Amino acid sequence: SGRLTGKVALVSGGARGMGASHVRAMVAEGAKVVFGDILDEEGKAMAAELADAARYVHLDVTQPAQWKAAVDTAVTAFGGLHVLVNNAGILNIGTIEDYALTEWQRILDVNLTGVFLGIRAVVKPMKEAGRGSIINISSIEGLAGTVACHGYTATKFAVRGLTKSTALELGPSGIRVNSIHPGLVKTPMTDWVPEDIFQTALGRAAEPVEVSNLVVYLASDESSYSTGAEFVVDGGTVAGLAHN
Amino acid sequence: SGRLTGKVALVSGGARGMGASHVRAMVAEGAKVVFGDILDEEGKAMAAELADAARYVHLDVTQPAQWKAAVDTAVTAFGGLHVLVNNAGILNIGTIEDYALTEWQRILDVNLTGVFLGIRAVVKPMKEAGRGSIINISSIEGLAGTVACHGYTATKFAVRGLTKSTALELGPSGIRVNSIHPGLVKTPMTDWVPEDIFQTALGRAAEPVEVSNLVVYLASDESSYSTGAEFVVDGGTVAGLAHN
Amino acid sequence: SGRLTGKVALVSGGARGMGASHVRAMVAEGAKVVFGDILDEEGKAMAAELADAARYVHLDVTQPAQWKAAVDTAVTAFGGLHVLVNNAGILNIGTIEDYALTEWQRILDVNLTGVFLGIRAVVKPMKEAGRGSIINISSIEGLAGTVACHGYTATKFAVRGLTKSTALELGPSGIRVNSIHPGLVKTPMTDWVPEDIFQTALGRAAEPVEVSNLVVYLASDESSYSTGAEFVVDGGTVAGLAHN
Amino acid sequence: SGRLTGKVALVSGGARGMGASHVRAMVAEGAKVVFGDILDEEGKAMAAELADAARYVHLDVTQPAQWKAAVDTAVTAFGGLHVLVNNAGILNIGTIEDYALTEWQRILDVNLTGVFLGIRAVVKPMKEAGRGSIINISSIEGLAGTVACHGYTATKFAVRGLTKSTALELGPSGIRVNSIHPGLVKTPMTDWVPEDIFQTALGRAAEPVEVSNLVVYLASDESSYSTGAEFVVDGGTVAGLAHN
């Protein structure tokens, strides 16, 4: 409570799912949040309940002009920008043969290029403020592979790597960059998937707030000495070997 | 300010350095702490200025009988045990040729067996309580190697592995096990080492409280979905490649 | 000698550098090689001194039609296709701020999409034979980060991930997929870089044949039980922590 | 045939299982092998069928004096020592509670200290010769955890770490140190385990020769630029996420 007081955050894909949960969790901790998405109806809806501590903006992470608009909104409406949560992303599947090249390009644009564009857009205000925290949402699919999940796996691994190179470059400016790797979380992106698809040590899927707690920790100054690192919140899946 | 209220913790090697910092940080968050060490003078000293919320006990992590005594103290004095911070450890160096077999055995006993004994000692009360968090202190030397640091590297890698196997086994009982890997921290164990020995992105060594913040996070229920994972707090060292 | 006898291989970017070395090394071991590139003069030149054992074809890894032509050449000229070495790649640098979006897209197309296209192109003939070995050339930049190397790092991490997902999917068909991660190698891509830029245990840069030896091993049936794995040939760089 | 001609190797635990397979594979490639174990009957038996290419010696890897005797045998009988294969090891299981402290100590002595003693014993002759190759046999249990496998997991992770620190230290002397991580292999140590206990991409357990092929590669000069690295030969297990 009051752990993010004075912090301004930008969250991509915050109209629903984990993104929405992150917005709510950060506001509850005293932060001012600008969240963007492409689902304007839902976005404006919850922008109404968070009232004056949040602002919704239309943001297609593949459009650099929209990223700039999102950043300008944060800076002029709240005075600055200290946190970026690259959460927007999509999921598509398909075996090597019947996986469309267009789906491949689409997921690269959103899941990878979108994350890169967000980082380019927030460095200026963060460098001026001399402090900042960028949180990239990857997944355990960015740690190991899965059948018929080539585009998703490739981009989640890429986001993991992009996190490291940018962390090294921005470190001297006081900006931290870390990646979060969650396992199965109950959201509209995976409501069609059985909750026990992964072998976990805790024996259950995660509630979105459980990932949000990690977002708050990484956004706060409590995690001041962690940068370029992978934070896993998967209930123990990648900690064990695949058995039958 | 009250993130650990109602939690009872046992910290090994808490008389000084990071251990002491963890004790203070957890008490400040509302936890009751039992800390043990072999430096009784210093231990009793700070137990006095924490008298109401903490208890000091003599604890040589290589002696199972002392671990049991430490656990009994926590349970009878505070009603239970929910957190274990395996922090006690030593550091010795030497090349392959002139590294004494006795130093090798000594570091294995303290840094590895000591950690195992602590886990065996706390599982009973934690399993009864139905909830628990075990935090094993490894290091980045448990992620990559260093010249003339064979005993330390071997044990820190082992602690990292022990964290995973125990997390899988204890998960069903509601107990989480995670490892922390810090880089250079300002403590008596490394005050003879130049603060910039490691290439970091932040360009500085860490203050012990920076590692304590991560201990609090892992001890709290905020990290409910993280288990068997490595949490790195090294200022970016392992995120980059070794350059000249 | 004769370790690859009866094997037909396709090597992308084989007109010079490591690619050329791989072609020569595999021919010396009894394999028939079809190598493609965009440097036609050099390509036809060495195709001439390798006469009956190799065939050169123009191949821009970003063009699916050219990949098909390359595969058809291998199958009709040599009877089949058992090995694919995704070696083609480019290197560009730049900081988050002054790194052109066009350079970013270019490296994604060649280093990542190019690798994906190669895999899609060879699965048919390999699945019919019920055997095959795909070797993806990543780098240690696909294991850790580097300043001003965002596009390269992102794609090399992605290739590492793509290797795992495809290995799991193709495993049942008898096809193995592995990634190679070399450190500094003496080639035209890095002749402007000081040979001791990386901290290595061997104290030297690698000769391209040293990486080719690993390519032969992975192409042969000797490595029959290795798939979806990372093979590091960096002289010890990623095995140690970055010191000053 | 003749890939290890002129090389002298020392293999611990070579009387049966993978160790025996390594001895046979290396002899077939032209190497002279000294293998030790504690199963003298079986050891002398196969020392007979290999003739003068192989010498058997009694060797308890926990006894430094016996290691010295093994090394002296190699040097005086064959003129030198260029390869060490730390293969000897044991397997015991048990949950945290009912796992005997004696079993814990026993596995630490054999699986970890035994490996360290072997390295200390061979550095002298290798440093004089200008180069050498040390191959430490870990396992995928040294990469991820398993329930009721605490001693085994801890030591296999430690061997993985010991491989890196020693590789960095010995690199300047021309000595390479690498670790091998196999999955399920058909040997007496695991003949009671169902061949499909692990989820693999290849859908089968490995034949010991498949791991021996990797030992030969690492023992030969073909792998000249690989050191301090993990070589996985697990049929794809650790490349994928644990599913149900």
Ligand SMILES: NC(=O)C1=CN([C@@H]2O[C@H](COP(=O)(O)OP(=O)(O)OC[C@H]3O[C@@H](n4cnc5c(N)ncnc54)[C@H](O)[C@@H]3O)[C@@H](O)[C@H]2O)C=CC1
């Ligand atoms: N659901 C799960 O189990 C897991 C999800 N993740 C990651 O977490 C992130 C969010 O996941 P969920 O909330 O579960 O998914 P979700 O589908 O609920 O939400 C993703 C959001 O991104 C927005 N979005 C999509 N394309 C966009 C674009 N071009 N520009 C801006 N916004 C766009 C969508 O409208 C949606 O609100 C993604 O990066 C996902 O890959 C990671 C691990 C597990």
Ligand SMILES: NC(=O)C1=CN([C@@H]2O[C@H](COP(=O)(O)OP(=O)(O)OC[C@H]3O[C@@H](n4cnc5c(N)ncnc54)[C@H](O)[C@@H]3O)[C@@H](O)[C@H]2O)C=CC1
């Ligand atoms: N100092 C550093 O830069 C880093 C330290 N670490 C780890 O953090 C932990 C604590 O480190 P520091 O506070 O810096 O060290 P420290 O030397 O300040 O404290 C270690 C404490 O353990 C106690 N201790 C030693 N042997 C013991 C035994 N057999 N039984 C019980 N207590 C014993 C010591 O008396 C001391 O109070 C260790 O596990 C260490 O490996 C990890 C990364 C970096």
Ligand SMILES: NC(=O)C1=CN([C@@H]2O[C@H](COP(=O)(O)OP(=O)(O)OC[C@H]3O[C@@H](n4cnc5c(N)ncnc54)[C@H](O)[C@@H]3O)[C@@H](O)[C@H]2O)C=CC1
């Ligand atoms: N040079 C080094 O130190 C290291 C190189 N690598 C990787 O090894 C691979 C080969 O590297 P080098 O031989 O050193 O580089 P190089 O520059 O000598 O050769 C790359 C080759 O790819 C060809 N190529 C480029 N774009 C192409 C396209 N669109 N279609 C077809 N061919 C194309 C080039 O013409 C050239 O022959 C690359 O994937 C590189 O990232 C990895 C680690 C270290």
Ligand SMILES: NC(=O)C1=CN([C@@H]2O[C@H](COP(=O)(O)OP(=O)(O)OC[C@H]3O[C@@H](n4cnc5c(N)ncnc54)[C@H](O)[C@@H]3O)[C@@H](O)[C@H]2O)C=CC1
């Ligand atoms: N069997 C498997 O699936 C896997 C085995 N490994 C590792 O490979 C190595 C050999 O495995 P296996 O051949 O399958 O086991 P094994 O039981 O067939 O052979 C181990 C050998 O070591 C010898 N030995 C035992 N204690 C010794 C001591 N104190 N000093 C000297 N020799 C001693 C034994 O007599 C035996 O011949 C071990 O390090 C094991 O952990 C790794 C991954 C999988």
Ligand SMILES: C[C@]12CCC(O)CC1CC[C@@H]1[C@@H]2CC[C@]2(C)C(=O)CC[C@@H]12
């Ligand atoms: C939902 C999950 C599991 C959680 C997540 O973040 C993404 C995916 C996407 C691909 C799915 C995987 C479960 C296993 C599937 C269902 C395979 O068997 C074919 C496609 C795979």
Ligand SMILES: C[C@]12CCC(O)CC1CC[C@@H]1[C@@H]2CC[C@]2(C)C(=O)CC[C@@H]12
């Ligand atoms: C202090 C540090 C760095 C922080 C830490 O937790 C442990 C050690 C122990 C061995 C040291 C290493 C710095 C580099 C040293 C000084 C080598 O050059 C020889 C022994 C090595």
Ligand SMILES: C[C@]12CCC(O)CC1CC[C@@H]1[C@@H]2CC[C@]2(C)C(=O)CC[C@@H]12
């Ligand atoms: C050549 C190497 C090292 C070998 C390789 O495969 C790629 C690169 C590309 C970026 C370079 C890096 C050396 C360090 C550099 C020079 C940084 O200081 C700015 C750009 C970086």
Ligand SMILES: C[C@]12CCC(O)CC1CC[C@@H]1[C@@H]2CC[C@]2(C)C(=O)CC[C@@H]12
């Ligand atoms: C054989 C194998 C699998 C191959 C290996 O190198 C060691 C072990 C040892 C512990 C076993 C594991 C299969 C799963 C087991 C059977 C658990 O369910 C309890 C003990 C575990």
